[PDB]
From a paper:
Candida boidinii NAD+-dependent formate dehydrogenase (CbFDH) is a homodimeric 82 kDa enzyme complex that catalyzes the reversible conversion of formate and carbon dioxide using NAD+/NADH coenzymes for electron transfer. Candida boidinii NAD+-dependent formate dehydrogenase (CbFDH) has gained significant attention for its potential application in the production of biofuels and various industrial chemicals from inorganic carbon dioxide. Here, we present high-resolution crystal structures of apo CbFDH determined at cryogenic and ambient temperatures, as well as as that of the highly active Val120Thr mutant of CbFDH at cryogenic temperature. The inherent capability of the enzyme to catalyze the conversion of CO2 to formate holds significant potential for reducing atmospheric CO2 levels.
In CbFDH, residue 120 (Val120) is a potential mutation site for studies aiming to create a more active enzyme variant as it is located in the catalytic and substrate-binding site. The lower K m value for formate for the Val120Thr mutant indicates an approximately 1.5-fold stronger affinity for substrate binding, while the higher k cat indicates a higher turnover number (6.57-fold) compared with the wild type. The overall catalytic efficiency (k cat/K m) is found to be approximately ten times greater in the mutant CbFDH. In order to observe the effect of the Val120Thr mutation, we determined the structure of the mutant CbFDH at 1.9 Å resolution and compared it with our wild-type structure. The structure is composed of two homodimers with 99.7% completeness. Superposition of wild-type CbFDH and the Val120Thr mutant demonstrated that the overall structure does not change significantly as a consequence of this single mutation (r.m.s.d. of 0.270 Å). However, a closer look at the mutation site revealed new hydrogen bonds that does not exist in wild-type CbFDH between the threonine at position 120 and three water molecules. In the mutation site, nonetheless, we observed three new hydrogen bonds between Thr120 and water molecules in the active site. These new hydrogen bonds may help to stabilize the active site, leading to greater activity. Also, the newly formed hydrogen bonds may help to position the substrate or coenzyme molecules in the active site and contribute to a more efficient electron-transfer process during the reaction. The reason for the increase in substrate affinity may be that threonine is more polar than valine, so that it can form hydrogen bonds to neighboring amino acids or water molecules, resulting in higher stability in the substrate-binding region.
Numbering used by the authors:
A (entry chain B): 1 to 353
B (entry chain A): 1 to 356
Amino acid sequence: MKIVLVLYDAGKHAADEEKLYGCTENKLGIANWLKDQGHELITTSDKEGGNSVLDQHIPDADIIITTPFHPAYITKERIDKAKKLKLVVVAGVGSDHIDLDYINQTGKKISVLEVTGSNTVSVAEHVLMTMLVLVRNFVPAHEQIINHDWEVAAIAKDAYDIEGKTIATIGAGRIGYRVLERLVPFNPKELLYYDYQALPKDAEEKVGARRVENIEELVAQADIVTINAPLHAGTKGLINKELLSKFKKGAWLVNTARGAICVAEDVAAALESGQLRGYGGDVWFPQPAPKDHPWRDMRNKYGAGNAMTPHYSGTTLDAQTRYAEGTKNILESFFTGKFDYRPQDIILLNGEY
Amino acid sequence: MKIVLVLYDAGKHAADEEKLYGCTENKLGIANWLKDQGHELITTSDKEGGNSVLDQHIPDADIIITTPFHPAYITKERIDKAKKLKLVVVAGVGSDHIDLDYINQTGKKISVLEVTGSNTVSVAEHVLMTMLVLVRNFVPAHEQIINHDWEVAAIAKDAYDIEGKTIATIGAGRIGYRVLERLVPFNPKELLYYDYQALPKDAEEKVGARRVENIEELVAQADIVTINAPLHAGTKGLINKELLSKFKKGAWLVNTARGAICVAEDVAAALESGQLRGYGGDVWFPQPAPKDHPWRDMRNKYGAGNAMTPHYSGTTLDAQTRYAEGTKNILESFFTGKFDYRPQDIILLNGEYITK
């Protein structure tokens, strides 16, 4: 079978770290395994254009492997041209780039899977890191040192402990609940959450969480807010100027879920005005972020409150090892005809939800 | 009575934040309370040189309040001249700037007290923050965004999860244990600790910690090491070239305790060579760190691995409130003649150590 793998070019960075499996140079560490079992592997980062390397190999590709950090868009047209396509695998988590709705409509027996759970701890750690970074004002503190300054008062005037703070998550799924778990020993005033379904009682009481029915009541009482929800009609443009006006004045906001859940200019304006003390996370919209994206230069009145990073929280070397092992297991379940997939990895089973 | 309060000058920052109590401008929030009680408060940042305002008022100061973040050095020489000195307060935690040995060995009737416990959470959080920042390679990632760049592989190639890492603390005192407590839900491979005395079994089990008998074996198996111990003859220069040669290659090191525990040049060499992936923390030697201190410019082979900040972890606004309240309570105990100090706050009571 022909398998087409789409990843970014790490370039020199691939030679620096052999564990950087999620690039074209290292091919998820499975090129030998596929060759061993008689399959042909097409690896490429060229995913745009009509003469992209991807598009030339779509017509007879049995399997297509993708990644959210260099997403090959499985479009309506490409689905039409993929005459031998049987399986689309996400070497990671996230299927925004796959036209799942169209695949289902065609009736084609195309399975789509992702390595569910491989990213959650990595993103959850990133939220708490970013919470602590903002609350404790780490970013301007490190800037003083590397700039050869020493002025404690300029850093302490807007630095707090995370203890005694009320923290709320919008969404309490795999990532959000793992964020709550890690926050318990920091002794927050309270942990709050809003979600379209209740946490199990035992899970709720393990972290001492209280559920808030609506999002104004949630944010209005929250010192820290973190976004851990899927992107859909309810959450698209959720964090806009109107909703931000009900945040506690000087709140800290963190979003590692999806940039589009916020309205970029509204968030930036809120930080500049003081409605937010700081904003952080690693997701953007558009993504990758243009050089002019307002979240790059936005700052609070003190020249701080920005803890943004590129979208990399879910591609740490430990996540990538899970991505590569998970993709191999999914491929193995397919090659052997057992189709013994993990139930949580299935997005579509032979075209069906 | 005359109280001499020594804090740093915050300048404009004091105007920006009234809750910045630990500076000369806001006087720990107790200026009016002391005035209402009939006491004379001398507040100054000038603490160096015989001509200093501090030295001018030492001879008839009844109480001296100090802070570790702008330490007035209560030396033997100054104690001899403090003819009326009855009480030395630390608006915070840390008493290395006070010559306790001279007070206790002469028998001078001077009490020294600190606001015990008020810094522990703040420092413990800052260790975890630094651990996460170094392990996940945050600094160069954020640097990319503010420099209008986007190259994920340049960051991912040295970014890890703190999950599944072995974390060792040198010292399991108040801060060391609170670091371990905050690490439990991050699912480390194991929490290890070294100390001159063992934790209680219940404390060990609560955080799943294992004691390693000697430093060399502790650091050899640790992905992450954090220093949470006092500076004494057993820890001065502990993190030096040899001990670093026995760290797990590519280890991350955090030190929020005392700069002098490390040999600064040795740590930077270990970071440049790759013995250490990163180094972070907020304590320096000398302190304040001069502009050419090696820890300011040092980096790993990727231009990253530096999570250094100025010494501020224990002076957040929440801690500063605990310091100010704690100082007021100590003074109230002194003014009323009750001397009902919190037992944990006593370093010396009338020049004598007391049972802990």
